[PDB]
Design a protein around this ligand. Structure first.
Ligand code: HEM
Ligand SMILES: C[C@]12CC[C@@H]3c4ccc(O)cc4CC[C@H]3[C@@H]1C[C@@H](O)[C@@H]2O
Ligand SMILES: C[C@]12CC[C@@H]3c4ccc(O)cc4CC[C@H]3[C@@H]1C[C@@H](O)[C@@H]2O
Length: 429
């Protein structure tokens, strides 16, 4: 009875386009736009995904309220991981008055991570930034006391947790596969770590954990419940910040002229004698523009999803209740009409005379837009500023593998930098 929306080619595997989505999601999404335009679809197992692109369609997507396009059940792969949410789990730590302190905390975490680097050596970006961001996230979003009781084990387990987000979750988040088994085992390991910390606290007597432990119903929360809360407080900001930091360093190393400009700027700026806690909250133009361009080319979330709660018409095409509706920062961020030479790294794109990020309000979307725009955006930008203010003034970096060999692993809904990502460092002098 109802007219079928345009469908992208391919998708003849068991679960439609799901197999291709797991192997090359960006290529799939780009083909949707190339073949069909601003509104096109692909099949994700038993669900149809209406992929929107372009300013007009994206505006509809981002301005829609939860009453029209619901985000609530659009990300099933998160249910097994976690086991009003922002107000309860994110807002407190993100208040403006807390930022100065967070910048100092982040600076401290970076110095601790590079304390044993010495004069020269080599690191792997995924291993370094994944661990560093576990410490900045836990210290800032949960507590310094809590972070001090964490070590490499927590980071290793958290990573396996993130790897348990295969697209098969859209079939069922509890299917019997290896990645989901490891996901549950990883979560169980985190619960054990938290339980140990709790017993240590109780053993010999205040942060967030101290408060949660004292809540009663007989203790109201188990280690599993507390662990779920902590996992949720750090998740949205961990893989995003980890990856963005890695790609920021990669692009600087790939474009030494920009790297040189950032170095000169940092040296001049800190010449006033103020701390990172002062400068990370204020303008650092060249670095900020490198970050904006890095986010445009390497958005950590390549697809955003919603579930339609009613019927809507976008450019003559009708979206029906129950349809999965999506927008893609990966595709939108590179629309050639909006971003001249979209595949090139051009930080000048954001300088005062151009401001391509502000002019393309509905297509420059690494942080999303509208009602669900990233609430941690300011924190994330401040964190990159604080991290590189320390790293780039203390050390010099060079690629230890071909520039084109650095890449992301897109096999899971949670994008992660692929290994190896070898980089050499040497103290500046
Ligand atoms: C530069 C790194 C980051 C990027 C690129 C980024 C990007 C995004 C995007 C695109 C969304 C929208 C998802 C959707 O529309 O369904 C989002 C949501 C969110 N982000 Fe981030 N984010 C980053 C860092 C962070 C950090 C560090 C935190 C924690 C302080 C955080 C917390 C959140 C939360 C709580 C939401 C949900 C917002 C809502 O649904 O109302 N993000 N982020
Ligand atoms: C209010 C709360 C207990 C306190 C928790 C709580 C307590 C202190 C803190 O710093 C953070 C949180 C986050 C979650 C809070 C729970 C939400 C509800 O499920 C429950 O009633
Ligand atoms: C659901 C989420 C927004 C979408 C994120 C999201 C969106 C797309 C994607 O491919 C991966 C992720 C990973 C993290 C997700 C966030 C966890 C919550 O803190 C927040 O509400």
């Amino acid at each position: 009875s109802a007219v079928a929306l345009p469908r992208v080619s391919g998708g003849h595997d068991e679960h439609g386009h799901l197999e291709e989505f797991r192997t090359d999601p960006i290529g799939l999404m780009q083909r949707v736009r190339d073949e069909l335009g601003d509104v096109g679809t692909f099949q994700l197992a038993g669900k149809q995904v209406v992929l929107l692109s372009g300013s007009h369609a994206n505006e509809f997507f981002f301005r829609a309220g939860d009453d029209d396009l619901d985000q609530a059940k659009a990300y099933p792969f998160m249910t097994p991981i976690f086991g009003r949410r922002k107000e309860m789990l994110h807002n407190a730590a993100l208040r403006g008055e807390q930022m100065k302190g967070h910048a100092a905390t982040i600076e401290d975490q970076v110095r601790r991570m590079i304390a044993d680097w010495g004069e020269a050596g080599e690191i792997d970006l995924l291993d370094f930034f994944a661990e560093l961001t576990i410490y900045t996230s836990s210290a800032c979003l949960i507590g310094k006391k809590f972070r001090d009781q964490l070590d490499g084990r927590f980071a290793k387990l958290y990573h396996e947790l993130e790897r348990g987000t295969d697209p098969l979750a859209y079939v069922d988040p509890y299917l019997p596969i290896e990645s989901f088994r490891r996901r549950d085992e990883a979560r169980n390991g985190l619960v054990a770590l938290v339980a140990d910390i709790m017993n240590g606290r109780i053993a010999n007597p205040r942060d967030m954990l101290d408060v949660l432990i004292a809540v009663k119903a007989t203790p109201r929360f188990s280690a599993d419940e507390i662990t779920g809360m902590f996992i949720s407080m750090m998740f949205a900001g961990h893989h995003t910040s980890s990856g963005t930091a890695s790609w920021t360093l990669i692009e600087l190393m790939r474009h030494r002229d920009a790297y040189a400009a950032v170095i000169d700027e940092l040296d001049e700026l800190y010449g006033d004698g103020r701390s990172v806690s002062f400068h990370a909250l204020r303008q650092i133009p060249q670095l900020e523009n490198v970050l904006k361009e890095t986010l445009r080319l390497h958005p950590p979330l390549i697809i955003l999803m919603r579930v339609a709660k009613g019927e809507f018409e976008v450019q003559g095409h009708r979206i029906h209740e129950g349809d999965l509706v999506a927008a893609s920062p990966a595709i939108s961020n590179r629309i050639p009409e909006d971003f001249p030479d979209p595949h090139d790294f051009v930080p000048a794109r954001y300088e005062q005379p151009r401001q391509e990020d502000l002019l393309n309000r509905w297509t420059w979307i690494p942080f999303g837009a509208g009602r669900h725009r990233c609430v941690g955006a300011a924190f994330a930008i401040m964190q990159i500023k604080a991290i590189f203010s320390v790293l780039l003034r203390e050390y010099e970096f060079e690629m230890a593998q071909p520039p084109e060999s650095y890449r992301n692993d897109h096999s899971k809904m949670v994008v992660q930098l692929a290994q190896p990502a070898a980089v050499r460092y040497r103290r500046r002098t």
